[PDB]
Design a protein around this ligand. Structure first.
Ligand SMILES: Cc1cc2nc3c(=O)[nH]c(=O)nc-3n(C[C@H](O)[C@H](O)[C@H](O)COP(=O)(O)OP(=O)(O)OC[C@H]3O[C@@H](n4cnc5c(N)ncnc54)[C@H](O)[C@@H]3O)c2cc1C
Ligand SMILES: Cc1cc2nc3c(=O)[nH]c(=O)nc-3n(C[C@H](O)[C@H](O)[C@H](O)COP(=O)(O)OP(=O)(O)OC[C@H]3O[C@@H](n4cnc5c(N)ncnc54)[C@H](O)[C@@H]3O)c2cc1C
Lengths: 479, 481, 482, 482
C-alpha cells in the first residue's frame, strides 16, 4: 500500500492501515516542508456545530455532511488516547480545549451571522447536544472593543481543539510504531494499466510498486488522478482554498480556556482563537479560492485577520508578539463536497476535497476508506461523496446567485466599512446582473458554489473559457 | 381666592386643568406665550416612559427606586386622563395617544458599561413588577431597516408603555382648561409679589399687576430664577439649569411609520435614541441632552448630526432619504441636586412644580393631582413629600459614585459616535480623565457634589462660572448648616 | 399693448425688471411672484460671485464651457457699479449687498483626485491665461479656518476681486430699485401665457385675473419651461428645465466671528461643492448640496443636512460644530436638460425667456439682464449668448462616451467626499460594475440625445414610468427638429 | 599588543573594521559577532541614505540637532566613493549596493499638521540653505504610486543624490572588503572587556576564550553601553542606550514592479515614518515603526504590523494589498537616553565606542568610521563630532517645556496617523488632559535631566519599579558630574 500525501488525512489512513493489516507493507510519501499544507496552518477546531450555517442545513447534501461531523466528534477521545499512548509526557498534549464559545457581534452581515447563529442553536437542540446560551458578561478572558463586542454567546460542551502540529508529530510516531515506512519524496505520476494500479513514480526518478494507492495529497489530489485515461472529467476538480492564520505570544502569557469563534463568514472565512500550550494562541482564518496555488499570505489577509482578532476577541493581542504567519491550501472541491472512496481503477482510492473540516473528520474518513479496502461498506452516509461522479448540484442557480451577492456584501460589513447609507442597496442591485451573466455563460446545467464563483468572476478571460470547456466536457461524459 | 399658574408647559396646564375642574369656586389664570420660549413640552415626542427610563445607576439609589415607583403609578392614570381631555374636543382635533407599546433595542453603538447594564436592569425591573413584556427575535421587529454594522442583536417588547403627540396634548390641555372656566393670559411673569410672608400676586412683562392668594410656578427651567428674587430664597430653592434637547420631525420617504415606540436605554449624560410615531406620514426622532448654565433656543450642528446619524444607522436607513420638516429645541428643567421641586414654600400660597428633567410630561397627571391635593389641605401622593422645593441640596450619591459615573459617561460619548481609535487610546483617556474631574469636585465644595450631567457642563464652563458655583454651594451650606 | 410682464421674482426676474423699468420710463412694467418664493434658488444662495472658482477641467474641455467661463469674467466687471446703483435707492439701515471682495480656494483629500486635483490645476491655469490677480499661498496664512487635521487643506489659492453678496439684501435692493424706477409688484403667480396669431396677449394669474401685455419675460426659475410649453408646438421646441435642489444653512458662530474672504473648494460630485460665504452680524452661510430631481422638492433630506454639516465642520472650522443652526435653506437651481441656459427670444413675438442658469444665474444676472433688454430694444446684446436661444433642438456638447466616463467618476466621487472607509479593492470593483448599467441606460433613452451626468444619475434612480416618459420626450424632440 | 578588536558586526562595526584593515596593514584587526545578528538594526533597514529626508523642525531648532544634520550632509558626500571602493572587491554577480539615486518626500493629511506641515517646510528650507539639488514637483508626475484618494499626497519633493542601499548586499560587501584587506572574522560574542591601570588588555568571548588587544572599538548596537558600563566608574559616565525596536517588511509586488526612487514621508509620531525603498527582483522594502523599549524585543507586535501595512497600502500603493508578504523584519535602533550618539574615545586608553546612532547610523557609517580611525591614529577626526564623545554628562538639548509640548503633540499624532475618526471636540480635550500627567512625570524623574519625547512616552507607560530605577539612575549621573 502507498499513501500519497502526509497531511492529517494521509497519515490518519496510514496509521489505520498499518494497525489493521500487520501483514501488508504501507509506505507514505510527502516531504517535511508540507508545501501548501492545510494541516500545519490549522488551529485546529474539532468543528461540528460551530461549522453549521443556515445555507448548509438547507440542502440535503449539507445535512448529511453535518451528520458525519457529529459522528466524527464521538471518535476523537479514543483516537487521541491511541495516538498519545505511542509517546511520552514531553511530546505534548494533542487536545488543547474541551469546549467552544460561539460569539455573535455586529461586525458582519445580518443575512449570514444572524441566520447562522439561529441555525447553530437549532442544530444543537435537534441533535440533543449539551450547550447553553450564556450572558456575554460570563465569557472569561475576552476584552473586545465595545463597538465590536458580542451581545450573544453560546457555550458548546465537548466541541474542542487540537494542536495540529502535535497531532502531525503523534500520527507520524504512531505510523512508525505500527510498522509504516515514511519515504520523504513526492509522487509525480500514478501507474495503471488494464484498469489496475501498478504503483507510483516519485520525484527523484524512482518507481515504487503497489496493489493499493490512496491519494490524500490535499489540493494536488485530483490533478494527480486526472492524468489516467478518461478520469479528467470523472473526478471533480479540487482548487486551493488559501488560508492565513497566525501564532501569537500573548502580552501576559494567558489564553482562553475554550475555543472562541464566530459562525462562518464571507466565502467561508471566519474568526477564531484556538488555545495552545506555553503562552501562545492560534488566530485564524482567512479563505480565498485560487485557481493556482499560493504559498504566501497577502498584506490584505494579514491585516483583516489581525484587525478582527484585536477588535472582536481581545485588544491585548494588539500589544502581543507575532511569532508566525501560516499559509495552507484547504482542498476546495469544484462541486463543494468531498472526494472519498473507490475509483473505476482497482486499488485506487481518494481522500480529499474536505475544505474546512478534513482534520475534524480524519478518524471517521480513515476508518471508512480502510473498511472499503478490506471489503466492507464503511460508514453509511459517505456513499454520495464517492470520488468518481458527475458534479453535484446541491443548490439551484437562483440560491447560489443570492448567496454570492450576500457574501460579496458581507466582505464589506466584516471590514467593517463606513459608507453613505444608500450605497449598499445600490451595490446589491448592480452585483446581481454581472454574476447572473457569468453563471449563464459558464454552463446550462452546472453552477459553481459562491466561494468558487467569486474567484472565477475576478480571474482572466482565458481561465473562465477553460472552465466553460471543463463544464461542457463533464456534461458530455455523464449526460 | 384667585390662583395664578406661571407657565404653559404640560405641568402648568395640567395643574391648571385640575384646579379649574376641582375648584369651581376659585378663579384660575395661566400665564405664558404661544412661542413657549425654551419649552421642553413642544420639543418632546413624547414617550410615556416608566420601564424604558430604567437604568442600573437610577435603581442603585433609594431616591431613584422611589422615582421609578411613581412613574409606574403615573402610567395607570394616562388612559382616563386622555379620555377626559379628548372629550372636550371633536374628531378633527386628532388623537393624543400615538402608540400603546414600546420596543427597546440593544446594539453595540455605545458603552457596554451603560447599554448592557441598562438592558439587564430594564428586563429585571419588568419581571419584579410582573409587567407584561417579551424578549423577541430582532427579525420579528416590524419596519426597522438598520445598517447591519449598527443593528440590534436583542429586542424587548413592553406592553402598555406608549407615546402621546406632545402638540395635540398641549392643544387638548388648553381647550380643556378654557372649558372648565380657566383664563389664558398670554404674557410672562417678571416678578412674584410677597409681603408679611404671603403672595399678593404677579407683575407681568407688559407692566400690569395680577392679584392672587395662590401662585403655582411651573415655568420649566425659569422656575427657580423667578422664586429666588424673594428674600432668603436664593439659597433655599435649589437651582434649575437648562437640559437642552434637540429632536426632529421627519416626513418618511413612503409615508410609513412603526406601530410601536422604538428606543434604546438612556445613554451618555441622559441622552438617548428613540422614534415616536405620529399621524400623517411624520415620525418624531430624539433626543440629545446637554446641561447648559445659560439657556439656548437653537440646536448646535453637533446635536443635529449626532441625532440624524444615530436614527439613520440604528433605526431606519430610509430616514436618510426622508424630508426634514422641523428641528425642535427645548430645555429639560435640570435641578442642581438631580431631584424635582414639587410642593409648598415658606411663603403662604406660593407653590412650585418643576425640575422634572426627562419625565415631567409622563408624570404630569400624578404631579398635577398631588399639588392640587396639597393646595386643598390634603397630603397628595406619598413619597413626593421628599421633593419639597424649599430644601438643602440633596446628596443621593457619594462623590466616588459620581466621579466613576462622569468618566464612564464621558467615554460613552466616544462609543456612541461611534469613534474609530487605536485600541490602547480608550484605556489611556479613561486613566487621564479621573484626575481633572476629581480635582474639580474637591474645588467646588467640601460637602456638595453635582451629578454627572451637571459636572461635565461645569468642567467645560468658564472660570468665572465655576467660581460663581463655588460661592453658590458655600452660601447654601451657610443657610442650612 | 406696450405693457411688460416679468414672470418670476428671483434675481433674474427682478434684475431684468429693474433694467426694463430704468431703460423704458414710457412703458408699464409689472413683476409677478409671491414673497414665499416657493423653490426659490436665489434666497437659498450665499452667494459667491463665482468666475474662476467655478472653473472645472470638464467645463474648459468643451467649446460651450469655455464661452460660459468668458461671460462669467465679463459679468464680474459689472458688479461694482450694479451694487452702487442698487444701494443708492436705499439708506444705511438696509445693509450692504457686498459681503466679501476675495475668495480662497482650498485643496484637501476629502474627495476624488480625478475631480479636485484636475479642477485645482484648471483654476490655476485659467487665472494665469486671463492674467487675473491671484496668489498660491501657504495654508498656514489662511485666516480663521481651524479644520480637522485629517481633513485639512495642503494647498490654498487667494483670488482678488472674486467675492460674495448677501442674496437676501440683494433681493430687497432689487425690489426697492424696481419700485424706484416705476415698476409695479403684483404678488401672484402666472398660471397661463395667452398668445394668438403668433403674438403674446398677456398672462392669466392664479387669482383668476388677466393682465394684458405686448412683452412677457419668463424668469420663473425651474417652472419657466413648464409655463411656455403649454403654447402650441413649444412642448418639444423649448428644452426642459428640472430642479437642481440645493441645501445650505445659516449658522451663528460660537464667538460671533467669520472669515474675511469666501472659503470654497472646486466643484465636486454632480456640481455640489463646499463653501462658506461671510454675512454681517455674527452669522455665516454654508453650502451647498446639489441633486437633480424630476419633480420639485421644498425640504432638505437628512442625508443633505448631515453631508453639508460634516464637510463644513471638518474641512473649514471645527468651531462650527458648537455653533447654533439658525436656518436650513432649500432652493431649486434651474437645471436645463441639455446643460445650457435658455436666454432670449421665441417664435412668439414679445415672448422672452431667462432661465436654466443652474449654478451661476445670480453671478451673471447683471450681464443677462442687459442682454435680454438689448434684444427687446432691437439690439444684439452680448456676443456669445446667441447660442443659448431658448427655442432650439437639445444641444449635444459632449459625446456619449465623455458623459459615461463623467457619471461613473462623479458617482465614485460621492464616496470619496463622504469620506467612506472601504477595503482597498472595493472602489475598482464598483467602478467596473457601474459602467454597464449607465451605458445600457444611455442607449435605451435615445439614439441621438444623451443627458449630462447630473441629470443621468437622477434618471438612473427614477421610476420606470418617468424613464419611459423621457424616451417619449427625446423621440418627440427628434421628430420636431430632424 | 597593537592588535585591534571590533566588537559588533553591524554596518558600524564592519565599516570601522574595513577602514582600520585598509589604513593599518601592519596590525591584526579581529571583528566579533554571529551571523544571526540578534536584534540587529542593519539587516532590518531598507535602507535610506537619509540626510534631508530626516530633517524635522524640532531637530533644526536645537544647536545639538543642527550639528547632527551637518554631519549627515557630510556623510552623503562620502557614499559614491565608499560604494565604489566596496563594489571593487567583488564582481557583477554579487549585486548592486545602490538601489536608488533619488528620494521623493510626500505630504498627505494622514497625520498631524504640527509635525508633517512644519517638517515639510523645514526640509524645503534645509535643502535651500545647503544648496542641495531638489525640486517641488506635481504629485501627478510621481511614478508608480497608486494611493487611496482619501490618503493621497497633495505636495511632493524630489531630492537628487539622496538614495538607498540594499542593507543585506552592503553587509556582504563590507565582510568581503574586510577579508580582502586582511581582517579576521571570529563569529563569537564579547561577554566582557578587560582593562587595568586605565588601559585595555582585550576581550573575553562567549566560548570562554580571551583575545588580547591594545585597541577595542565597541559597535555592538543597543548592547554597547551595557558592555562598557561594567568597567569601574563608567556606569554613570557613559549614557545609557535603549532598544528603538523597528518593524519593516519585504513584499513581492503583485506585478514585480517597484518605484525608481525612495518614497517617504517626513518623520512622524515618536520617530516612526512611512517609506518604500526599492530592491532588485520584484521585491520592495516597506518601513518603519519605532518604539523605545526598556528591555530588548526580537518580534513585531500585531499593532506594528497592521500600522505599517495600513500606511503603505493607503498612502503609497493599493496594489501592495494584493502583494505577497515575504518577511517581517525586527531590529533595535540604538536609542541613547539623551538623544545623541556615543562616538569617540574614553578615559580608558585604546577603548573606543561607536553607537547610539538611532535612525541614521547606517547613513553616517563611512563618516563615523573615518572619524574613529583618525582619533586612533593620533588625529582629531571630523570637527562637529566633539559634543558626541561617549564619556559625558547627559546632554540637555531642549528645555523641559519644549519636550512636554513635543510629547503631547507626538501623542496626538499617533491619533491623526491611524487615522482615527472622533467627535470634533475630543482632540482639544485630550490635548489639555495630557499636559498634566507628563508635566508630573518630568518633575518626578529629576530636577535637571528630561528624557526626550521618544523615551518619555516609554517611561510614562512602564511599571513603577522601572520608573523608580530611572530616578536612581538620573540622580547617580548628577552625583558623578555635578
Ligand atoms: C488556515 C486553515 C485553517 C484550518 N482550520 C481548521 C479547523 O479549525 N478545523 C478543521 O477541522 N480543519 C481545519 N483546517 C483543515 C481542513 O479540515 C482541511 O480540509 C484538511 O487539513 C485537509 O487535509 P489533507 O490531509 O487532505 O491536506 P493537507 O493538509 O494539505 O496535506 C496534504 C499533503 O500532501 C502533500 N503533497 C502534495 N502533493 C504531493 C505529492 N505529489 N506527493 C506527496 N505529497 C504531496 C502536501 O505537501 C501536504 O503536506 C484548516 C486549514 C487551513 C488551511
Ligand atoms: C443652494 C444654492 C446656492 C447657490 N449659490 C449660488 C452662488 O454661490 N452663486 C451664484 O451665482 N448663484 C448661486 N445660486 C443660484 C444660481 O445662480 C441660480 O441659477 C439663480 O438663483 C437662478 O435665479 P432665477 O431668478 O432664475 O430663479 P429663482 O431664484 O428660482 O427665482 C424664480 C422665482 O419665480 C417664482 N415663480 C415660480 N413659478 C412662478 C410663476 N408661475 N409665476 C411667478 N413667479 C413664479 C419662484 O417662486 C421664485 O421666487 C445658488 C442656488 C442654490 C439653490
Amino acid at each position: 500500500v502507498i499513501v500519497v500525501g502526509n497531511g492529517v488525512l494521509g497519515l490518519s489512513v496510514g496509521v489505520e492501515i498499518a494497525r489493521t493489516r500487520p501483514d501488508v507493507r504501507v509506505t507514505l510519501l510527502g516531504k517535511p516542508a508540507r508545501q501548501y499544507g492545510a494541516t500545519p496552518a490549522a488551529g485546529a477546531m474539532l468543528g461540528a456545530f460551530g461549522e453549521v450555517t443556515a445555507h448548509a442545513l438547507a440542502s440535503e447534501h449539507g445535512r448529511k455532511k453535518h451528520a458525519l461531523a457529529v459522528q466524527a466528534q464521538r471518535l476523537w477521545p479514543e483516537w487521541i488516547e491511541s495516538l498519545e499512548a505511542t509517546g511520552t509526557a514531553a511530546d505534548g498534549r494533542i487536545k488543547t480545549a474541551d469546549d467552544t464559545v460561539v460569539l455573535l457581534n455586529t461586525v458582519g452581515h445580518s443575512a449570514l451571522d444572524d441566520a447562522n447563529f439561529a441555525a447553530v442553536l437549532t442544530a444543537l437542540k435537534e441533535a440533543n447536544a449539551p450547550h447553553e446560551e450564556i450572558a456575554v458578561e460570563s465569557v472569561d478572558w475576552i476584552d473586545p472593543d465595545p463597538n465590536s463586542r458580542p451581545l450573544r454567546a453560546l457555550h458548546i460542551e465537548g466541541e474542542g481543539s487540537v494542536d495540529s502540529g502535535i497531532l502531525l508529530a503523534a500520527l507520524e510516531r504512531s505510523f512508525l510504531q505500527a510498522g509504516g515506512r515514511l519515504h520523504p519524496v513526492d509522487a509525480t505520476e500514478i501507474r495503471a494499466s488494464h484498469g489496475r494500479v501498478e504503483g507510483v513514480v516519485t520525484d527523484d526518478g524512482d518507481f515504487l510498486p503497489a496493489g493499493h494507492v490512496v491519494v490524500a495529497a490535499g489540493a494536488r489530489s485530483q490533478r494527480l488522478v486526472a492524468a489516467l485515461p478518461g478520469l479528467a472529467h470523472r473526478i471533480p476538480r479540487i482548487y486551493d482554498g488559501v488560508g492565513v492564520s497566525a501564532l501569537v505570544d500573548t502580552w501576559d502569557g494567558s489564553g482562553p480556556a475554550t475555543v472562541l469563534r464566530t459562525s462562518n463568514r464571507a466565502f467561508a472565512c471566519g474568526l477564531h482563537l484556538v488555545p495552545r500550550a506555553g503562552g501562545s494562541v492560534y488566530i485564524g482564518a482567512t479563505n480565498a479560492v485560487c485557481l493556482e496555488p499560493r504559498g504566501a499570505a497577502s498584506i490584505e489577509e494579514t491585516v483583516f485577520l489581525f484587525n478582527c482578532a484585536t477588535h472582536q476577541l481581545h485588544r491585548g493581542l494588539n500589544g502581543s508578539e507575532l511569532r508566525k504567519v501560516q499559509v495552507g491550501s484547504r482542498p476546495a472541491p469544484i462541486d463543494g463536497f468531498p472526494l472519498i472512496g473507490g475509483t473505476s481503477v482497482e486499488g485506487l482510492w481518494m481522500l480529499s476535497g474536505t475544505y474546512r473540516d478534513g482534520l475534524h473528520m480524519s478518524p471517521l474518513l480513515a476508518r471508512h476508506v480502510v473498511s472499503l479496502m478490506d471489503g466492507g461498506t464503511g460508514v453509511d452516509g459517505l456513499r454520495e461523496f464517492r470520488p468518481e461522479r458527475d458534479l453535484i448540484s446541491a443548490w439551484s442557480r437562483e440560491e447560489i446567485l443570492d448567496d454570492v451577492v450576500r457574501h460579496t456584501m458581507a466582505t464589506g460589513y466584516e471590514f467593517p466599512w463606513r459608507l453613505p447609507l444608500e450605497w449598499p442597496h445600490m451595490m446589491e442591485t448592480f452585483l446581481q446582473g454581472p454574476f447572473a451573466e457569468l453563471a449563464d455563460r459558464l454552463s446550462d446545467t452546472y453552477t459553481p458554489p459562491a466561494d468558487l464563483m467569486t474567484a472565477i468572476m475576478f480571474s482572466e478571460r482565458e481561465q473562465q473559457d477553460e472552465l466553460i470547456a471543463y463544464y461542457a466536457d463533464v456534461h458530455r461524459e455523464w449526460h
